[PDB]
Design an enzyme around this catalytic site. Structure first.
Site, PDB file in Angstrom:
ATOM      1  N   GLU A 248       0.874  -1.209   0.000  1.00 31.55           N
ATOM      2  CA  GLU A 248       0.000   0.000   0.000  1.00 31.55           C
ATOM      3  C   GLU A 248       0.900   1.245   0.000  1.00 31.55           C
ATOM      4  O   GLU A 248       0.783   2.077   0.909  1.00 31.55           O
ATOM      5  CB  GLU A 248      -1.017  -0.059   1.148  1.00 31.55           C
ATOM      6  CG  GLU A 248      -0.425  -0.032   2.549  1.00 31.55           C
ATOM      7  CD  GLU A 248      -1.438  -0.075   3.685  1.00 31.55           C
ATOM      8  OE1 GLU A 248      -2.538   0.499   3.527  1.00 31.55           O
ATOM      9  OE2 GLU A 248      -1.119  -0.667   4.737  1.00 31.55           O
TER      10      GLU A 248
ATOM     11  N   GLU B 228       4.530   8.745  -3.662  1.00 32.06           N
ATOM     12  CA  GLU B 228       5.324   8.176  -2.537  1.00 32.06           C
ATOM     13  C   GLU B 228       6.384   7.198  -3.068  1.00 32.06           C
ATOM     14  O   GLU B 228       7.027   6.537  -2.230  1.00 32.06           O
ATOM     15  CB  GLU B 228       4.382   7.499  -1.544  1.00 32.06           C
ATOM     16  CG  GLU B 228       3.422   8.467  -0.885  1.00 32.06           C
ATOM     17  CD  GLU B 228       2.434   7.831   0.077  1.00 32.06           C
ATOM     18  OE1 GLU B 228       2.481   6.596   0.251  1.00 32.06           O
ATOM     19  OE2 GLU B 228       1.620   8.576   0.652  1.00 32.06           O
TER      20      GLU B 228
END
Ligand SMILES: CSC[C@H]1O[C@@H](n2cnc3c(N)ncnc32)[C@H](O)[C@@H]1O
Ligand SMILES: Cc1cc2ncccc2nc1N
Ligand SMILES: [Cl-]
Ligand SMILES: [Cl-]
Lengths: 622, 303
Positions: free
Chosen positions: A420, A429
């Site tokens: 995730e 990210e």
């Protein structure tokens, strides 16, 4: 509770007026601080040598009453853009006099009119007053949806009202506001008091005020219709506009004399406030954070705090989708005849405090298949929580690995890698670089969950969010650095100028002989309205497995994913966009060994500078 | 006395003579603690503005922006509250009793004028609207939003109940005629401030602008003069067969003018703005002005 105020142009006794207004139930009173017919000479004798007092004493109310209950009103005779030099010079002095007496009393707001095109000298004098003393008071520019000229009765014989649709002409009052606030350099203290007429304009005229700093909405008594019982009410179209303004939490001002013959008017706004579309699960948790700019999280570069993991974990719908993606994957890989023999090697890459570890265990139970888990986690603080969970509950099934997935030497290869590592812009990210380095210990037929993710961009208008970004000028950096970086934000007071289009995609596993995670994307956005471009909203979609998906894209949004706000890419200079024109945006994903970053530029309808060149203002750490 | 306030308010706004020569003074307090107004009667005009030597007096709730006579007894008043008030005198004319006070305007009522008939009147407000009133039934017959800004002055036709003028900060001078489906008509410069019909000639009127210029205009299809330095507040013709035009202004000066608008008389007596003027029907040569200096200056115009 609706914040509401009375607008009077007649105050015989200031104390007795507030007492009647308080018993009616208003929170505040708009009123003249000097009498509205009391015209004043400053240059020419003998009128300039008038004996005082020039207005009421400040001692008639307490300091608390001025700070909360009173709003100032510029006297109607003050016309700083008059064609006569004498009226121009007296208006300048009278405007500073009235504004400085408002600052002396310490009023929270002061009402100035915008009732014509040229308010240039009006803007200068207000800008002069703003840069005089450290006092901090609001200035509500009173401006209507439709000008008095464009809503007048068709009763002048030799000057008939135009029945032809003028598209740009019907939005003229927005241009009055835009020119005024632009001249005053987007002061945060200058807001809109939007005045509603008896007949509303077309939707495009009302949509023109989306994104604008509306702090008040003026409702005349004349616009209210009457029902069978005789109480004051509004039409369905007017009610639709009030529900939009209640979301902006404006202060509803009531103006004019009683036609329904006074709390009857204010009690109707309360009835609409209760009877509205209800507060949904997305808007309930998002309360407080509306248009609040935050730094996007970087779980690779930074170690996330315990409460940040608690926020991610408070989302049982999103993990039941991860459970479903693993449930369907284990059935497709392991057949029924190989149930007890075939044990699948799951590897949670970036396991935090083990929400996917638990979702993987719950998936194996309902699938009725054996698994072997690896909780890989870089942040050694979160590993404390994993190893306490692993000792007390999971046991030898889960092997915790306190390591970077790019560095870690795996003892066996993975059948499935669950992760995730997605932000609000999907790849912001650095999930691509992280899984690319973790790809070597995936088996030749191995599955990634998620297997695919795509970022989305849409152009937006918000003069409010433009000001919020503009106010982030920090002390020891480039003075326009705030415009060259993304912000996670619950976008609320804004206008989506075109449907979102896909920007960057990544697939996992990436089975290519030459892997390049850098990107360049040219998008073209058809715009059907007149507006001002202030930035680009960013969303994402992801395929966990086959048809099980997660999305924060508004039109295809996943259920109950409340905490996950979109990202905002601002621009330095707001760009004018006509109805019909195309916003052409450019987006790069760039990288070196040390840093990954976004660059972006608008190329049509006019050219912007390239934002964040070589990540000078923003980098995502590897 | 009786049942009247002791101190009269500073800013004198209106001054009008009725047939028998009693002076109607209207006043507002435009500063200080209380922003109210008041209506007064002076059967001795020379006694004004002295309160103790007056015939009648009464307190209004808000200030008085303009007023006018309704025949011999009635007093029509334009209030700050957004209401047209009608006050009638009693049998002996000692008291001034309110007949009605209807709150119909959404902003200050600035200008008011009684029509030729006397049973009806017209008002103008900062709310942009012009309303035709019935004084018997005490109701709005018609409500017109012709202008796009504050209604500065409205002036009823002398001899025609349907026709009247209006002017506004939208730079329009509208000739009205309520018998038409579209009653307003735009005649045609700096913003028009004051209006006055010619008393003998039905097709001719004069208007003053904000730049201190009075102009003579015929309805069909022009002469003008720079009279004042500042805004022309009011224009009042005399009662003579060949009438003289009194012109008021914010430059604190009176100027009486001839047929061709040439300066006969000048008076810099007022120290504040001159607000309203009125000619005595007993002596046509006299002219009474009032202003915010709280003076009642009785002039002697050389004729
Ligand atoms: C559950 S929040 C995302 C998690 O992924 C972890 N993470 C991010 N990058 C890496 C990496 N390269 N190796 C291992 N874990 C990572 C972060 O520490 C965080 O706990
Ligand atoms: C796991 C995770 C959750 C997030 N939730 C909101 C915004 C960013 C997030 N990034 C993550 N890696
Ligand atoms: Cl921030
Ligand atoms: Cl760099």
């Amino acid at each position: 509770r609706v914040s509401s105020g009375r607008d009077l142009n007649c105050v015989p006794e200031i104390a007795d007026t507030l007492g009647a207004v308080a018993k009616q139930g208003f929170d505040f009173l708009c009123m003249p601080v000097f009498h509205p017919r009391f015209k004043r000479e400053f240059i020419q004798e003998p009128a300039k040598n008038r004996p005082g007092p020039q207005t009421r004493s400040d001692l008639l109310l307490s300091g608390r009453d001025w700070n909360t209950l009173i709003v100032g009103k510029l006297s109607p005779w003050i016309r700083p853009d008059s064609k006569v030099e004498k009226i121009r010079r007296n208006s300048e002095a009278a405007m500073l006099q009235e504004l400085n007496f408002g600052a002396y009393l310490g009023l929270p707001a002061f009402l100035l009119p915008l009732n014509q095109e040229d308010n240039t000298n009006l803007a200068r004098v207000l800008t002069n007053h703003i840069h005089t003393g450290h006092h901090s008071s609001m200035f509500w520019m009173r401006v209507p949806l439709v000008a008095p000229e464009d809503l007048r009765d068709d009763i002048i014989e030799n000057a008939p009202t135009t029945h032809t649709e003028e598209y740009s002409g019907e939005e003229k009052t927005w241009m009055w506001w835009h020119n005024f606030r632009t001249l005053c350099d987007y002061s945060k203290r200058i807001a809109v008091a939007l005045e509603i007429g008896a007949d509303l304009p077309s939707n495009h005229v009302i949509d023109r005020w989306l994104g604008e700093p509306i702090k008040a909405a003026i409702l005349p008594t004349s616009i209210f219709l009457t029902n069978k019982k005789g109480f004051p009410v509004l039409s369905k179209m007017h009610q639709r506009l009030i529900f939009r303004l209640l979301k902006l939490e404006v202060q509803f001002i009531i103006t004019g004399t009683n036609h329904h013959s006074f709390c009857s008017y204010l009690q109707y706004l309360e009835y609409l406030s209760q009877n509205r579309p209800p507060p949904n699960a997305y808007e309930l948790f998002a309360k407080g954070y509306e248009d609040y700019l935050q730094s996007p999280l970087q779980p690779l570069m930074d170690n996330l705090e315990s409460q940040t993991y608690e926020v991610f974990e408070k989302d049982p719908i999103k993990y039941s989708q991860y459970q479903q993606a693993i449930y369907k994957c284990l059935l497709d890989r392991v057949p029924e005849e190989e149930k007890d023999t075939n044990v699948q090697v799951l590897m949670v890459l970036g396991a935090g405090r083990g929400p996917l570890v638990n979702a993987s265990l719950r998936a194996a139970k309902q699938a009725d298949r054996r698994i072997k888990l690896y909780a890989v986690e870089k942040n050694p603080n979160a590993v404390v929580t994993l190893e306490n969970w692993q000792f007390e509950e999971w046991g030898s099934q889960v092997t915790v690995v306190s390591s970077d997935m790019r560095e870690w030497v795996a003892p066996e290869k993975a059948d499935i890698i669950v992760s995730e590592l997605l932000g609000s812009f999907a790849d912001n990210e650095l999930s691509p670089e992280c899984l690319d380095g973790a790809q070597h210990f995936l088996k030749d037929d191995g599955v990634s969950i998620p297997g695919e993710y795509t970022s989305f961009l849409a152009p937006i208008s918000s003069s409010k969010l433009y000001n919020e970004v503009r106010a982030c000028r920090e002390k020891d950096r480039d003075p326009e650095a705030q415009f060259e970086m993304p912000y996670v934000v619950r976008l609320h007071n804004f206008h989506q100028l075109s449907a979102p289009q896909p920007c960057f995609t990544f697939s996992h596993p990436n089975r290519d002989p030459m892997i390049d995670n850098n990107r360049y994307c040219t998008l073209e956005f058809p715009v059907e309205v007149n507006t001002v471009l202030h930035g680009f909203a960013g969303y994402f979609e992801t395929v966990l497995y086959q048809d099980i998906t997660l999305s924060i894209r508004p039109e295809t949004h996943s259920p109950g994913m409340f905490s996950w706000f979109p990202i905002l890419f601002p621009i330095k200079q707001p760009i004018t966009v006509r109805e019909g024109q195309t916003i052409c945006v450019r987006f790069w994903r760039c990288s070196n060994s040390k840093k990954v970053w976004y660059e972006w530029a608008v190329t049509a309808p006019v050219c912007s500078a390239i934002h964040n060149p070589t990540g000078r203002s923003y980098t995502i750490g590897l | 006395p009786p049942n009247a306030p002791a101190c009269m308010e500073r800013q004198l706004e209106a001054a009008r003579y009725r047939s028998d020569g009693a002076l109607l003074l209207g006043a507002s307090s435009l500063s200080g603690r209380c922003w109210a107004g008041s209506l007064w009667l002076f059967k001795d005009p020379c006694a004004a503005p002295n309160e103790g030597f007056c015939s009648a007096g009464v307190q209004t709730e808000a200030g008085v922006a303009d007023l006018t006579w309704v025949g011999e007894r009635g007093i029509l008043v334009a209030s700050d509250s957004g209401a047209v008030e009608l006050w009638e005198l009693d049998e002996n004319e000692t008291l001034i009793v309110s007949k009605f006070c209807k709150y119909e305007h959404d902003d200050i009522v600035s200008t008011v004028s009684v029509l030729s008939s006397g049973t009806q009147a017209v008002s103008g407000s900062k709310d942009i609207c012009i309303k035709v009133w019935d004084l018997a039934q005490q109701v709005v017959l018609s409500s017109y939003r012709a202008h796009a800004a504050q209604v500065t002055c409205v002036a009823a036709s002398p001899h025609k109940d349907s026709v009247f003028l209006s002017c506004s900060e939208d730079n329009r001078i509208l000739l009205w005629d309520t018998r038409c489906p579209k009653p307003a008509s735009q005649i045609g410069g700096y913003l028009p401030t004051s209006l006055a019909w010619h008393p003998q000639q039905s097709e001719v009127f004069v208007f003053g602008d904000e730049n201190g210029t009075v102009s003579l205009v015929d309805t069909k299809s022009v002469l003008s003069s720079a009279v004042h330095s500042q805004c022309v507040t009011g224009l009042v013709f005399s009662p003579h067969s060949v009438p003289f035009l009194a012109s008021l202004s914010e430059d604190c000066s009176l100027a009486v003018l001839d047929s061709s608008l040439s300066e006969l008389f000048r008076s810099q007596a007022h120290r504040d703005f001159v607000r309203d003027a009125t000619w005595s029907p007993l002596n046509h040569s006299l002219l009474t002005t009032v202003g915010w200096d709280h003076q009642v200056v009785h002039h002697v115009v050389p004729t």
